Short mmCIF file of C-alpha atoms and ligand atoms in Angstrom, two decimals:
data_model
loop_
_atom_site.label_atom_id
_atom_site.label_comp_id
_atom_site.label_asym_id
_atom_site.label_seq_id
_atom_site.Cartn_x
_atom_site.Cartn_y
_atom_site.Cartn_z
CA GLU A 2 -2.20 -5.68 11.72
CA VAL A 3 -1.26 -7.38 8.44
CA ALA A 4 -2.98 -7.13 5.06
CA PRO A 5 -1.96 -8.54 1.66
CA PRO A 6 -2.10 -7.00 -1.82
CA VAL A 7 -4.96 -7.61 -4.24
CA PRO A 8 -4.99 -11.28 -5.31
CA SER B 5 9.96 18.84 -7.67
CA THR B 6 11.44 20.23 -4.46
CA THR B 7 8.66 18.45 -2.57
CA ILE B 8 9.51 15.14 -4.24
CA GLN B 9 13.09 15.60 -3.02
CA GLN B 10 11.79 16.40 0.48
CA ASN B 11 9.64 13.27 0.32
CA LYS B 12 12.69 11.21 -0.74
CA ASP B 13 14.61 12.57 2.27
CA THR B 14 11.79 11.58 4.63
CA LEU B 15 11.72 8.12 3.06
CA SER B 16 15.46 7.80 3.64
CA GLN B 17 14.56 7.66 7.36
CA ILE B 18 11.82 5.04 6.79
CA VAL B 19 13.07 2.63 4.13
CA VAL B 20 15.26 -0.30 5.24
CA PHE B 21 17.23 -2.06 2.57
CA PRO B 22 17.96 -5.78 2.80
CA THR B 23 21.29 -7.24 3.74
CA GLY B 24 23.22 -8.98 1.00
CA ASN B 25 22.64 -8.83 -2.71
CA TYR B 26 19.60 -7.06 -4.13
CA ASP B 27 18.54 -4.98 -7.13
CA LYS B 28 19.73 -1.54 -6.05
CA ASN B 29 18.21 0.21 -9.07
CA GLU B 30 14.77 -1.31 -8.60
CA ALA B 31 14.88 -0.57 -4.86
CA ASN B 32 15.51 3.09 -5.74
CA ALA B 33 12.62 2.96 -8.21
CA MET B 34 10.29 1.70 -5.48
CA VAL B 35 11.39 4.54 -3.18
CA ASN B 36 10.82 7.04 -5.99
CA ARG B 37 7.25 5.81 -6.46
CA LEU B 38 6.70 6.06 -2.70
CA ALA B 39 7.94 9.66 -2.85
CA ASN B 40 4.75 10.60 -4.73
CA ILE B 41 2.75 10.04 -1.52
CA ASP B 42 1.82 13.31 0.17
CA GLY B 43 4.54 14.44 2.53
CA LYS B 44 2.09 14.75 5.41
CA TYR B 45 1.61 10.97 5.38
CA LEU B 46 5.34 10.26 4.99
CA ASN B 47 6.22 12.54 7.89
CA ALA B 48 3.60 10.81 10.06
CA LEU B 49 5.02 7.39 9.18
CA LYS B 50 8.48 8.69 10.10
CA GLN B 51 7.16 10.12 13.36
CA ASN B 52 5.67 6.72 14.26
CA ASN B 53 8.96 4.89 13.59
CA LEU B 54 7.31 2.91 10.78
CA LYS B 55 9.95 1.14 8.72
CA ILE B 56 9.40 0.18 5.08
CA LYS B 57 11.43 -3.01 4.81
CA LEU B 58 12.57 -3.94 1.30
CA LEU B 59 13.35 -7.64 0.89
CA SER B 60 15.30 -9.79 -1.52
CA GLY B 61 13.49 -12.98 -0.50
CA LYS B 62 10.22 -14.29 0.88
CA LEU B 63 8.39 -12.28 3.56
CA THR B 64 8.03 -15.39 5.74
CA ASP B 65 11.80 -15.91 5.68
CA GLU B 66 11.93 -12.89 8.01
CA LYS B 67 11.79 -13.71 11.71
CA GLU B 68 8.86 -11.39 12.41
CA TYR B 69 6.71 -13.00 9.68
CA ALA B 70 7.62 -16.67 10.15
CA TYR B 71 4.35 -17.13 12.05
CA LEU B 72 2.52 -16.51 8.74
CA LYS B 73 4.01 -19.60 7.07
CA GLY B 74 1.20 -21.61 5.51
CA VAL B 75 -1.41 -18.99 6.40
CA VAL B 76 -3.84 -17.98 3.65
CA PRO B 77 -4.16 -14.17 3.69
CA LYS B 78 -7.48 -12.39 4.02
CA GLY B 79 -9.25 -12.42 0.66
CA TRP B 80 -6.79 -14.93 -0.84
CA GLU B 81 -9.05 -17.94 -0.31
CA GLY B 82 -8.94 -20.24 -3.33
CA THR B 83 -5.75 -18.84 -4.86
CA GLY B 84 -3.75 -21.82 -3.60
CA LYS B 85 -1.23 -19.30 -2.23
CA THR B 86 -0.13 -18.56 1.33
CA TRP B 87 1.81 -15.70 2.90
CA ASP B 88 4.94 -17.60 1.83
CA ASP B 89 4.05 -16.63 -1.76
CA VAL B 90 2.83 -13.05 -1.21
CA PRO B 91 5.24 -10.29 -2.30
CA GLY B 92 4.04 -7.54 0.06
CA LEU B 93 2.57 -6.84 3.49
CA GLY B 94 1.17 -3.71 5.08
CA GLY B 95 -0.52 -2.64 8.31
CA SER B 96 1.39 -2.22 11.56
CA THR B 97 4.55 -2.91 9.55
CA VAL B 98 5.51 -2.83 5.86
CA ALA B 99 7.59 -5.47 4.03
CA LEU B 100 8.00 -5.58 0.26
CA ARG B 101 9.85 -7.85 -2.16
CA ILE B 102 11.99 -5.93 -4.62
CA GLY B 103 11.02 -6.50 -8.23
CA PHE B 104 7.36 -7.32 -7.57
CA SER B 105 5.87 -3.81 -7.75
CA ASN B 106 3.79 -4.15 -10.92
CA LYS B 107 0.36 -5.72 -11.34
CA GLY B 108 0.79 -9.39 -12.18
CA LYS B 109 3.97 -10.01 -10.15
CA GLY B 110 2.33 -12.40 -7.74
CA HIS B 111 -0.49 -9.93 -7.07
CA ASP B 112 -3.10 -7.83 -8.87
CA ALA B 113 -2.63 -4.48 -7.13
CA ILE B 114 -1.96 -1.41 -9.25
CA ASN B 115 1.34 -1.11 -7.33
CA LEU B 116 2.67 -3.29 -4.51
CA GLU B 117 4.49 -0.71 -2.36
CA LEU B 118 1.77 1.97 -2.57
CA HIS B 119 -0.99 -0.52 -1.67
CA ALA B 120 0.98 -1.84 1.31
CA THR B 121 2.04 1.61 2.56
CA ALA B 122 -1.53 2.86 2.13
CA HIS B 123 -2.65 0.21 4.60
CA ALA B 124 0.05 1.29 7.04
CA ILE B 125 -1.13 4.90 6.67
CA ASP B 126 -4.74 3.79 7.14
CA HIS B 127 -3.89 1.83 10.30
CA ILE B 128 -1.05 3.78 11.91
CA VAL B 129 -1.62 7.38 10.81
CA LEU B 130 -5.36 7.59 10.20
CA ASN B 131 -6.59 5.29 12.99
CA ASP B 132 -8.36 2.88 10.61
CA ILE B 133 -10.36 5.56 8.80
CA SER B 134 -11.24 2.98 6.15
CA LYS B 135 -13.54 1.39 8.74
CA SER B 136 -15.19 4.65 9.79
CA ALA B 137 -18.84 5.37 9.01
CA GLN B 138 -17.90 8.05 6.50
CA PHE B 139 -15.73 5.83 4.34
CA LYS B 140 -18.01 2.80 4.72
CA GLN B 141 -20.74 4.97 3.19
CA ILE B 142 -18.43 5.75 0.26
CA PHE B 143 -17.24 2.12 0.08
CA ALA B 144 -20.84 0.90 -0.11
CA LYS B 145 -21.47 2.98 -3.23
CA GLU B 146 -18.14 2.88 -5.08
CA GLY B 147 -16.36 -0.17 -3.61
CA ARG B 148 -17.16 -2.28 -6.68
CA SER B 149 -16.02 0.24 -9.33
CA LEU B 150 -12.29 -0.57 -9.32
CA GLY B 151 -12.67 -4.26 -10.19
CA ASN B 152 -11.69 -7.26 -8.09
CA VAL B 153 -15.08 -6.87 -6.44
CA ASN B 154 -14.67 -10.03 -4.37
CA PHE B 155 -11.70 -8.29 -2.66
CA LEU B 156 -11.87 -4.50 -3.04
CA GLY B 157 -15.66 -4.57 -2.98
CA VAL B 158 -15.82 -6.59 0.23
CA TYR B 159 -13.06 -5.18 2.47
CA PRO B 160 -13.25 -1.38 2.92
CA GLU B 161 -9.63 -1.22 4.09
CA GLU B 162 -8.61 -2.90 0.81
CA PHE B 163 -10.68 -0.51 -1.29
CA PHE B 164 -9.08 2.37 0.63
CA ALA B 165 -5.55 1.04 0.15
CA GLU B 166 -6.01 0.36 -3.58
CA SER B 167 -7.76 3.68 -4.18
CA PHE B 168 -4.95 5.44 -2.30
CA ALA B 169 -2.51 3.66 -4.61
CA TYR B 170 -4.42 4.85 -7.70
CA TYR B 171 -4.44 8.39 -6.31
CA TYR B 172 -0.67 8.60 -5.86
CA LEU B 173 0.97 6.21 -8.34
CA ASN B 174 0.87 8.51 -11.37
CA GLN B 175 -1.37 10.95 -13.23
CA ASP B 176 -3.00 8.20 -15.31
CA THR B 177 -4.19 6.14 -12.35
CA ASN B 178 -5.16 9.34 -10.53
CA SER B 179 -7.44 10.23 -13.46
CA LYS B 180 -8.90 6.71 -13.58
CA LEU B 181 -9.84 6.85 -9.90
CA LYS B 182 -11.62 10.20 -10.31
CA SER B 183 -13.70 8.83 -13.18
CA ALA B 184 -14.60 5.55 -11.48
CA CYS B 185 -14.87 6.64 -7.83
CA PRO B 186 -15.53 10.39 -7.58
CA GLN B 187 -16.58 10.36 -3.91
CA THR B 188 -13.50 8.32 -3.00
CA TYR B 189 -11.28 10.71 -4.99
CA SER B 190 -12.72 13.75 -3.23
CA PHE B 191 -12.38 11.96 0.11
CA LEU B 192 -8.68 11.35 -0.51
CA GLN B 193 -8.22 14.90 -1.79
CA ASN B 194 -9.69 16.33 1.41
CA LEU B 195 -7.71 13.92 3.59
CA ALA B 196 -4.45 15.43 2.32
CA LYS B 197 -5.52 19.05 2.95
ZN1 ZN C 201 -4.28 -4.90 0.77
#
Protein backbone atom coordinates (compact mmCIF):
# COMPACT_ATOMS: atom_id res chain seq x y z
CA UNK A 1 0.00 0.00 0.00
CA UNK A 2 1.26 3.46 -1.01
CA UNK A 3 -0.51 6.81 -0.71
CA UNK A 4 0.76 10.35 -1.41
CA UNK A 5 0.24 13.60 0.49
CA UNK A 6 -2.43 16.13 -0.43
CA UNK A 7 -1.65 17.66 -3.84
CA SER B 1 6.10 15.87 28.92
CA THR B 2 7.27 12.48 30.18
CA THR B 3 4.98 10.89 27.59
CA ILE B 4 6.53 12.95 24.80
CA GLN B 5 9.93 11.62 25.89
CA GLN B 6 8.53 8.08 25.92
CA ASN B 7 7.14 8.67 22.43
CA LYS B 8 10.55 9.93 21.27
CA ASP B 9 12.15 6.74 22.62
CA THR B 10 9.65 4.57 20.73
CA LEU B 11 10.35 6.58 17.57
CA SER B 12 14.07 5.97 18.03
CA GLN B 13 13.26 2.31 17.21
CA ILE B 14 11.18 3.26 14.15
CA VAL B 15 12.92 6.19 12.44
CA VAL B 16 15.72 5.42 9.96
CA PHE B 17 18.00 8.25 9.05
CA PRO B 18 19.56 8.50 5.58
CA THR B 19 23.15 7.69 4.81
CA GLY B 20 25.39 10.59 3.92
CA ASN B 21 24.74 14.27 4.41
CA TYR B 22 21.36 15.50 5.61
CA ASP B 23 19.84 18.23 7.77
CA LYS B 24 20.23 16.70 11.22
CA ASN B 25 18.32 19.49 12.96
CA GLU B 26 15.32 19.29 10.66
CA ALA B 27 15.30 15.48 10.92
CA ASN B 28 15.08 15.87 14.70
CA ALA B 29 12.26 18.39 14.25
CA MET B 30 10.31 15.89 12.15
CA VAL B 31 10.76 13.23 14.85
CA ASN B 32 9.62 15.70 17.49
CA ARG B 33 6.41 16.39 15.56
CA LEU B 34 5.86 12.64 15.20
CA ALA B 35 6.25 12.31 18.97
CA ASN B 36 2.91 14.11 19.40
CA ILE B 37 1.12 11.03 18.00
CA ASP B 38 -0.50 8.95 20.73
CA GLY B 39 1.93 6.42 22.14
CA LYS B 40 -0.50 3.57 21.51
CA TYR B 41 -0.12 4.09 17.75
CA LEU B 42 3.67 4.50 17.96
CA ASN B 43 4.05 1.32 19.98
CA ALA B 44 1.91 -0.57 17.44
CA LEU B 45 4.06 0.72 14.57
CA LYS B 46 7.15 -0.43 16.49
CA GLN B 47 5.57 -3.82 17.16
CA ASN B 48 4.89 -4.24 13.42
CA ASN B 49 8.51 -3.40 12.48
CA LEU B 50 7.32 -0.33 10.55
CA LYS B 51 10.26 1.89 9.71
CA ILE B 52 9.90 5.63 9.13
CA LYS B 53 12.60 6.27 6.54
CA LEU B 54 13.87 9.85 6.34
CA LEU B 55 15.47 10.71 3.00
CA SER B 56 17.82 13.34 1.67
CA GLY B 57 16.79 12.77 -1.94
CA LYS B 58 13.92 11.62 -4.13
CA LEU B 59 11.71 8.75 -2.94
CA THR B 60 12.08 6.99 -6.31
CA ASP B 61 15.88 7.05 -5.95
CA GLU B 62 15.35 4.34 -3.30
CA LYS B 63 15.44 0.78 -4.61
CA GLU B 64 12.06 -0.15 -3.12
CA TYR B 65 10.30 2.80 -4.80
CA ALA B 66 12.02 2.79 -8.20
CA TYR B 67 8.96 1.02 -9.63
CA LEU B 68 7.01 4.26 -9.01
CA LYS B 69 9.13 6.28 -11.45
CA GLY B 70 6.83 8.14 -13.82
CA VAL B 71 3.71 6.96 -12.00
CA VAL B 72 1.08 9.61 -11.21
CA PRO B 73 -0.09 9.08 -7.60
CA LYS B 74 -3.72 8.60 -6.67
CA GLY B 75 -5.47 11.96 -6.67
CA TRP B 76 -2.53 13.73 -8.34
CA GLU B 77 -4.05 13.63 -11.84
CA GLY B 78 -3.46 16.91 -13.64
CA THR B 79 -0.68 18.19 -11.38
CA GLY B 80 1.96 17.29 -13.96
CA LYS B 81 3.86 15.56 -11.14
CA THR B 82 4.80 11.92 -10.64
CA TRP B 83 6.06 9.96 -7.64
CA ASP B 84 9.53 11.21 -8.63
CA ASP B 85 8.40 14.66 -7.44
CA VAL B 86 6.41 13.67 -4.32
CA PRO B 87 8.12 14.36 -0.97
CA GLY B 88 6.37 11.69 1.11
CA LEU B 89 4.81 8.23 1.01
CA GLY B 90 2.76 6.27 3.51
CA GLY B 91 0.91 2.97 3.75
CA SER B 92 2.71 -0.35 4.17
CA THR B 93 5.92 1.68 4.48
CA VAL B 94 6.80 5.31 5.24
CA ALA B 95 9.40 7.43 3.39
CA LEU B 96 9.78 11.17 3.87
CA ARG B 97 12.07 13.82 2.41
CA ILE B 98 13.69 15.98 5.06
CA GLY B 99 12.84 19.65 4.75
CA PHE B 100 9.46 19.17 3.05
CA SER B 101 7.22 18.93 6.13
CA ASN B 102 5.24 22.15 5.74
CA LYS B 103 2.25 22.83 3.51
CA GLY B 104 3.48 24.13 0.17
CA LYS B 105 6.74 22.13 0.02
CA GLY B 106 5.71 20.08 -2.96
CA HIS B 107 2.41 19.14 -1.30
CA ASP B 108 -0.63 20.72 0.37
CA ALA B 109 -0.90 18.55 3.49
CA ILE B 110 -0.97 20.25 6.88
CA ASN B 111 2.20 18.24 7.66
CA LEU B 112 4.02 15.70 5.50
CA GLU B 113 5.23 13.21 8.12
CA LEU B 114 1.98 13.13 10.12
CA HIS B 115 -0.14 12.60 6.98
CA ALA B 116 2.11 9.77 5.76
CA THR B 117 2.38 8.08 9.18
CA ALA B 118 -1.38 8.41 9.63
CA HIS B 119 -1.85 6.32 6.50
CA ALA B 120 0.56 3.71 7.84
CA ILE B 121 -1.40 3.64 11.11
CA ASP B 122 -4.67 3.38 9.17
CA HIS B 123 -3.36 0.49 7.06
CA ILE B 124 -1.01 -1.42 9.37
CA VAL B 125 -2.39 -0.78 12.86
CA LEU B 126 -6.09 -0.13 12.30
CA ASN B 127 -6.74 -2.58 9.45
CA ASP B 128 -7.95 0.12 7.03
CA ILE B 129 -10.52 1.61 9.40
CA SER B 130 -10.83 4.59 7.05
CA LYS B 131 -12.67 2.26 4.66
CA SER B 132 -15.01 0.83 7.30
CA ALA B 133 -18.73 1.58 7.28
CA GLN B 134 -18.45 3.71 10.41
CA PHE B 135 -15.86 6.09 9.02
CA LYS B 136 -17.39 6.14 5.54
CA GLN B 137 -20.56 7.44 7.21
CA ILE B 138 -18.52 10.20 8.86
CA PHE B 139 -16.55 10.83 5.65
CA ALA B 140 -19.78 11.23 3.68
CA LYS B 141 -20.90 14.07 5.95
CA GLU B 142 -17.65 15.86 6.84
CA GLY B 143 -15.21 14.76 4.12
CA ARG B 144 -15.55 18.09 2.29
CA SER B 145 -15.04 20.37 5.31
CA LEU B 146 -11.22 20.39 5.37
CA GLY B 147 -10.77 21.74 1.83
CA ASN B 148 -9.11 20.02 -1.11
CA VAL B 149 -12.49 18.40 -1.71
CA ASN B 150 -11.35 16.74 -4.94
CA PHE B 151 -8.83 14.77 -2.81
CA LEU B 152 -9.85 14.67 0.87
CA GLY B 153 -13.53 14.69 -0.06
CA VAL B 154 -13.19 11.76 -2.46
CA TYR B 155 -10.80 9.31 -0.77
CA PRO B 156 -11.84 8.39 2.80
CA GLU B 157 -8.33 7.14 3.62
CA GLU B 158 -7.00 10.59 2.65
CA PHE B 159 -9.57 12.40 4.76
CA PHE B 160 -8.64 10.10 7.65
CA ALA B 161 -4.91 10.68 7.23
CA GLU B 162 -5.25 14.48 6.95
CA SER B 163 -7.71 14.67 9.84
CA PHE B 164 -5.35 12.53 11.93
CA ALA B 165 -2.59 15.01 11.06
CA TYR B 166 -4.75 17.95 12.17
CA TYR B 167 -5.55 16.13 15.41
CA TYR B 168 -1.93 15.58 16.41
CA LEU B 169 0.18 18.31 14.78
CA ASN B 170 -0.48 21.02 17.37
CA GLN B 171 -3.22 22.60 19.46
CA ASP B 172 -4.21 25.05 16.71
CA THR B 173 -4.87 22.39 14.07
CA ASN B 174 -6.52 20.20 16.70
CA SER B 175 -8.97 23.03 17.43
CA LYS B 176 -9.61 23.63 13.72
CA LEU B 177 -10.52 19.98 13.17
CA LYS B 178 -13.01 19.99 16.05
CA SER B 179 -14.76 23.05 14.63
CA ALA B 180 -14.87 21.80 11.04
CA CYS B 181 -15.35 18.05 11.57
CA PRO B 182 -16.83 17.33 15.00
CA GLN B 183 -17.80 13.72 14.27
CA THR B 184 -14.33 13.02 12.88
CA TYR B 185 -12.73 14.65 15.94
CA SER B 186 -14.80 12.54 18.33
CA PHE B 187 -14.03 9.45 16.24
CA LEU B 188 -10.29 10.08 16.56
CA GLN B 189 -10.66 10.88 20.27
CA ASN B 190 -12.38 7.55 20.90
CA LEU B 191 -9.88 5.66 18.73
CA ALA B 192 -7.06 6.67 21.09
CA LYS B 193 -8.91 5.59 24.26
ZN1 LIG C 1 -2.33 10.80 1.70
